[PDB]
Amino acid sequence: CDIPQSTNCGGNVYSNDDINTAIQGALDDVANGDRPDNYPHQYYXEASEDITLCCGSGPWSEFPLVYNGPYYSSRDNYVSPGPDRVIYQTNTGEFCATVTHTGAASYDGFTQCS
Numbered sequence: 001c002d003i004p005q006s007t008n009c010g011g012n013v014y015s016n017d018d019i020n021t022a023i024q025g026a027l028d029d030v031a032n033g034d035r036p037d038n039y040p041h042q043y044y045x046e047a048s049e050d051i052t053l054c055c056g057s058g059p060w061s062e063f064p065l066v067y068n069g070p071y072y073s074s075r076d077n078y079v080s081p082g083p084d085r086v087i088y089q090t091n092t093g094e095f096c097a098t099v100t101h102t103g104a105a106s107y108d109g110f111t112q113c114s
Helices: 016-031
Strands: 007-010 010-013 041-045 062-064 084-089 093-102
Touching: 007 093, 010 016, 016 062, 016 084, 016 093
Parallel strands: none
Antiparallel strands: 007 010, 041 062, 062 084, 084 093
16 A cells, blocks of 8 residues: 555654655665565465555565664674564565564564554
8 A cells, every 4th residue: 555654663653754765675675685684574474363464465575664774784783673564565565564563462473553
């Protein structure tokens, strides 16, 4: 769907530019064989009960959502991905959702941003 003007991930508010930057960043990264901290990761889901995608069929990818993006981490300079992520349609770059570990029931769990 169209990138929202802003999104609230457990207190961290990101703009449409932060979101777009994450997706564009991830696509460029993949195109050049640079996968910072091994992201993007595949998003395996439609079975998900608390995450609603606003995009079509998979495959779906997930990449860290951060300020002054896009997220980047290097061989000798580790940078934490933080708790927030963007999910996009792998083959098209279509925005699907913003999710976060913040406010989830377990450390590895996710909830949708508002």
